[PDB]
Design a protein around this motif. Structure first.
Motif, short mmCIF file in Angstrom:
data_model
loop_
_atom_site.label_atom_id
_atom_site.label_comp_id
_atom_site.label_asym_id
_atom_site.label_seq_id
_atom_site.Cartn_x
_atom_site.Cartn_y
_atom_site.Cartn_z
N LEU A 236 22.38 32.44 36.11
CA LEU A 236 23.70 33.05 36.13
C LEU A 236 23.61 34.54 36.41
O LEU A 236 24.35 35.08 37.26
N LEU A 237 22.68 35.20 35.73
CA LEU A 237 22.43 36.61 35.98
C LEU A 237 22.05 36.91 37.45
O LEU A 237 22.51 37.92 38.02
N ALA A 238 21.22 36.04 38.04
CA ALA A 238 20.76 36.20 39.43
C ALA A 238 21.95 36.10 40.38
O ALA A 238 22.11 36.91 41.29
N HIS A 239 22.80 35.11 40.12
CA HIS A 239 24.01 34.91 40.92
C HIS A 239 24.97 36.12 40.87
O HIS A 239 25.46 36.57 41.93
N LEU A 240 25.19 36.68 39.68
CA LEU A 240 26.01 37.88 39.50
C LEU A 240 25.34 39.15 40.03
O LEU A 240 26.05 40.08 40.44
N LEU A 241 24.01 39.21 40.05
CA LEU A 241 23.31 40.30 40.78
C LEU A 241 23.57 40.23 42.30
O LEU A 241 23.81 41.25 42.93
N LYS A 242 23.50 39.03 42.84
CA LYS A 242 23.65 38.77 44.28
C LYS A 242 25.09 39.00 44.75
O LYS A 242 25.31 39.74 45.69
N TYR A 243 26.07 38.42 44.04
CA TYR A 243 27.46 38.41 44.48
C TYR A 243 28.30 39.22 43.53
O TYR A 243 28.29 38.95 42.34
N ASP A 244 28.99 40.22 44.04
CA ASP A 244 29.91 41.01 43.28
C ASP A 244 31.20 41.16 44.07
O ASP A 244 31.19 41.54 45.24
N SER A 245 32.32 40.87 43.39
CA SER A 245 33.61 40.90 44.01
C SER A 245 34.08 42.30 44.40
O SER A 245 34.84 42.45 45.33
N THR A 246 33.58 43.31 43.69
CA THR A 246 33.88 44.72 43.97
C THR A 246 32.82 45.39 44.86
O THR A 246 33.15 46.13 45.74
N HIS A 247 31.55 45.19 44.56
CA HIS A 247 30.51 45.98 45.19
C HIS A 247 29.78 45.30 46.31
O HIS A 247 28.79 45.85 46.81
N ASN B 34 26.15 28.24 48.46
CA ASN B 34 25.83 29.05 47.26
C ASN B 34 26.97 29.32 46.28
O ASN B 34 26.92 30.32 45.56
N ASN B 35 28.01 28.47 46.28
CA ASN B 35 29.14 28.57 45.35
C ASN B 35 29.88 29.91 45.44
O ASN B 35 30.14 30.58 44.43
N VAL B 36 30.23 30.27 46.65
CA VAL B 36 30.86 31.54 46.93
C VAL B 36 32.38 31.49 46.64
O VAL B 36 32.97 30.43 46.45
N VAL B 37 32.98 32.67 46.54
CA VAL B 37 34.44 32.81 46.43
C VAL B 37 34.88 33.71 47.58
O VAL B 37 34.05 34.15 48.36
N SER B 38 36.17 33.97 47.72
CA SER B 38 36.65 34.63 48.93
C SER B 38 36.06 35.99 49.17
O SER B 38 35.81 36.33 50.32
N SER B 39 35.82 36.78 48.13
CA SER B 39 35.20 38.12 48.26
C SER B 39 33.87 38.12 48.97
O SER B 39 33.57 39.03 49.71
N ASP B 40 33.10 37.09 48.70
CA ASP B 40 31.74 36.93 49.31
C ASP B 40 31.77 36.68 50.82
O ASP B 40 30.78 36.87 51.50
N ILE B 41 32.93 36.30 51.31
CA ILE B 41 33.17 35.92 52.70
C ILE B 41 33.57 37.12 53.56
O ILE B 41 33.55 37.03 54.78
N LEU B 42 33.95 38.22 52.92
CA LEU B 42 34.44 39.39 53.62
C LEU B 42 33.26 40.01 54.34
O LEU B 42 32.23 40.22 53.75
N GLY B 43 33.44 40.31 55.63
CA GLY B 43 32.37 40.79 56.46
C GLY B 43 31.52 39.71 57.10
O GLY B 43 30.65 40.03 57.85
N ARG B 44 31.77 38.43 56.85
CA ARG B 44 30.98 37.39 57.52
C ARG B 44 31.36 37.36 59.01
O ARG B 44 32.53 37.66 59.39
N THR B 45 30.36 37.03 59.83
CA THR B 45 30.46 37.11 61.28
C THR B 45 30.69 35.74 61.96
O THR B 45 31.05 35.70 63.13
#
Lengths: 338, 338, 338, 338
Positions: free
Chosen positions: C44-55, B280-291
């Motif tokens: 793009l909006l869906a992707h940014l809803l799903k993945y957030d580097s802060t939240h 899903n074109n993730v970056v490092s933040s998206d990986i935090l908490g993965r098991t």
């Protein structure tokens, strides 16, 4: 007999080229910036010339007028022409060559507009297709002739990679290779996650808090600079949270069996102002302000051998901003020999 | 019939193992932490269990007494014994297995002290030599027997690399390969430049403002986990300014000619709780908490071909803290089947 | 029976409001988002809803169609109308109230366009002049009447400051005060030094490697929220390198002599969902995801006394994104009582 | 004719003092470092002298021997004595004054050990109690006499605050005031969350990803430097993610009614090498390498007035490392006049 430079686009690279040219002018090189073209207010441009968060404060008095930046009491005209053929810097200021940094003129056909204004040659600060020459100074500047009016400097990453690849190719042969550049974030990345022009899902992500994979063209385009490696390299990047300072790793299959020491001695032979040999266990901060296009790091060289197979990893640092800038300035000087 | 765990060293990994075990206990797995051994004040330990800058706030009431951490009204004894054979957690708390996280007990011979205290088995949270087994869950846990009393989990990086290497080796064969892990900074790095224990010139440098090359052992040690690749891999790391979240690149020569899609389909076949497939074109933040131990990224797979030669780049993300932790917890569960 | 919300502008705040509303919908609250209006591609909006580097990652399945975002199989229409009076979400989707997040509609006169589309009320996510009410939930929401069709939520900083100021004003009186908010960088700051829209010399600077002073309006505008303090407060900000999480310091002369303990007890009396009392020695990371508008920190309270003169420093944390968002959502709920 | 300096502790400050003294020696000043005492391997010390992630590369050749650092071919002896009275640098190297940077000698009684080795005077790079003088150069160096053998420089924050406070006190009077310093992280903070020596719950937290409140002594100790303000100031700090560069805000009640312009003109009158007036809209990066103790920023000055009450906010930047260092070096020069 000074080479006179016009800068189109006073962005990060343009400003650093201004700094670099002034520094070389102080060391007696026969080159000067005479004029700039940019749509931003000169006061704002002057302030960004003076203060840089990465490159430090410019050690000169800097101010502005309505239509100029002033450095140590000398005026540098800032024109504001969206179309290059309307900039009058050839007749008003004596511009010989243009450093083209705007992004709007990144092809042979577009940058010909400068030639319509009486400019002798244009160096584009970006990859610009394959109907013009892509020059990495110290590797293929001698392919330039009197007929080359529009030239690409390639990318920052091409200028990091090509000197190392060139040395490896001459000494050992490269059969195939793949690059990863661990790279500083850049100005077109997003500070926080949000929509980005183009819609790229990774370019959209917060740059200073993520490792972000990014597509590159520098390895696939190596054939423009070293024709015998056309189609033999590929690569990508990982954007990480430093504001400047990058490193290029190349993993190669060479035409010959080698040791790490042998590889490192071979790189040392090609040391030059464009290609530095740096054995002092440096980190990215130490690389900021370096003037070489590529700073080879022999401490990271690794040869992995299993049976009859060998993989060779070679690593070069670069100041993705200033290394690139200084390579371009050397190429502008080379234009005067044409 | 709960597997009861004692944690020796309540550092970052120990605390996250505590969190992970409590989460699995909520989902009905038969495992619990019963006691901790650590020389730090319990109040400080409780606070660090509750609040983490990377992993968020633990969603439980957390407090402390003089000699315990309290979570949701339940006491967890904190002993303070510098010598493992003096910890009375077997008779007092029913400890079956110890998670050994202190760094002081990183060999077969040293960790036998726990066995003198009546502990059944020890899992060391670090590489611990080659006279004991190094286990990466999903790759070689079935080599464990009733006789294995002291076990290494390897490193965080070994647990990222081995699942990907395992899949490649089974499907294609690996002849030779070299790794680069672009890796989060860790707790033993320096915040600002200064002398470091050992004298390493790179470990001495400010961690959150530099790309810092670092030696690794995970690729050279792969033979401990997958014996048929002994001596065929090597690698290193680049430490970059993220606080957690890492990525492992492997460049390989495979025993067979492949496409990128073929490689990716092959990784998808080995998907499991330890080895995730993440397109899903993730970056490092998206990986935090993965098991998962290793999160394969098919969007970064690259096959570079020239003539008869092919280089294959495969890339796996990991939460260098939590991926590693969860791999260890799976291995602790596996100990109950011995 | 459900309050139905349309979101105009699916930027960082709009997306977080979507998340917040869905979370409250799960806890029984009678509120839902029914439609979005935004010019960005839905994918793009869906992707940014799903993945957030802060939240963090939104714990729902998220995908898209050509004209919608999909969450857990439910379609949310994304319209793409640059003019609010042309959005058909009232008749098509049953929109009652609009959360106006675009920046293009930040006045009473501009946002009336929504009312022309049949919208009952608009809450603007920004300060919007003084011919409409500025509402900070828990402070002055009871000034709203049936006639208030267009309302400002103020800024993120107003929502951090006003609860604390309100409590101080009621318990002690404020004679004069000055604020400094140490504040996360925001999406309109520059990643590297370069020209910025407007020409501000400080807004031009690299945001994640600088402390940057910034002008604010939240203290000077306090009279809109608490009329008796009109003209008695002023302040500014220091932008620092965290991506989210901020803190507001207020230094006051109070109408009465006080102790720090007395001040802290007074704040505890006004504790609510909008105004949290947080004594646990937290740092900014711990504040991320908090739902209060202002999180009072009694550990930072200081009273400095010399002769008959007294200065009182009070400090409130806030998640400058999510605290603000949740305040706005409470205000949208309050609209249903009008 | 040269003031000869011994440095005890070659930490960040000691090394920067070495750099500063060498720079002043190049500009004619009659001062030199002759010897160092430190327990770290000289090779490591030499490397950290040469390369600094914040302050750049030292523009000199730097190497080492078994017992010395070498700079441009000149040897600087590194002794390794844990007890100061055993360092033979007075007879061997001609040390006049010692810069005491170790943290182990932070009282009048402890640093007397240097005097037992024949040292004339000691300047401690930290607050050191109240039975010796605390000197902020440009404020109270003229209180030093021939009898002052052991002296404190105060802290980095005292040197930022005192010049500004001094000017305000002389021109207007201060009745009461409170400070907040927004401050770079320092070397004793944690890179990731973990136990810290002392047990402080906030000092335990990841420094480069948090705003962290921190207790300070610089305002409460102002009476040591400016006796008439004893007990009239207090303050604290917010540690933020920059590696160097800080700013001190002071909110004051003055003995007189003022305007912002009047305040700023008053600061301009006290401009000196220790107290710079900086109106050019700078950010923290621009402050790195500044040699003043305190850099006043008139763009941030605010006077808030309501009825007969007035609050005055004044703001001074500082390079918490180098500003402090250069202040200390000016004080070491002042010792030669005693």
């Amino acid at each position: 007999m000074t080479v006179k430079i016009g800068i189109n686009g006073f962005g990060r690279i343009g400003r650093l080229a201004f700094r670099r040219i002034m520094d070389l002018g102080e060391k007696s090189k026969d080159i000067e910036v005479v004029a700039i073209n940019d749509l931003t207010t000169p006061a704002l441009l002057a302030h960004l010339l003076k203060y840089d968060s990465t490159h430090g404060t410019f050690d000169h008095e800097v101010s502005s007028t309505e239509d100029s930046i002033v450095v140590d009491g000398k005026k540098y005209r800032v024109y504001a022409e969206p179309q290059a053929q309307n900039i009058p810097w050839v007749k008003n200021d004596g511009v010989d060559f243009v450093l083209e940094c705007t992004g709007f003129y990144t092809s042979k056909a577009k940058s010909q507009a400068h030639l319509d204004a009486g400019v002798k040659r244009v160096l584009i600060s970006a990859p610009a297709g394959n109907d013009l020459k892509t020059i990495v100074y110290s590797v293929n500047q001698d392919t330039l002739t009197a007929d080359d009016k529009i030239v690409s400097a390639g990318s920052c990453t091409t200028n990091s990679l090509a000197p190392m690849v060139n040395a490896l190719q001459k000494e050992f042969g490269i059969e195939v290779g793949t690059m990863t550049t661990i790279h500083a974030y850049t100005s077109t990345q997003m500070i926080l996650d949000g929509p980005v022009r183009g819609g790229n899902l990774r370019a959209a992500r917060a740059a200073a808090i993520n490792i972000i994979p990014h597509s590159t063209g520098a390895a696939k385009a190596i054939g423009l600079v070293i024709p015998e490696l056309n189609g033999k390299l590929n690569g990508h990047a990982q954007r990480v949270p430093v504001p400047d300072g990058s490193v290029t790793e190349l993993v190669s299959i060479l035409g010959k069996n080698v040791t790490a020491d042998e590889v490192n001695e071979a790189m040392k032979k090609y040391e030059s102002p464009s290609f530095e040999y740096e054995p002092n266990n440096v980190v990215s901060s130490d690389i900021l302000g370096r003037t070489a296009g590529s700073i080879f790091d022999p401490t990271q060289t690794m040869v992995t051998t299993a049976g009859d197979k060998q993989l060779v990893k070679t690593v070069a640092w670069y100041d993705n901003e200033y290394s690139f800038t200084c390579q371009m300035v050397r190429t502008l000087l080379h234009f005067a020999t044409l």
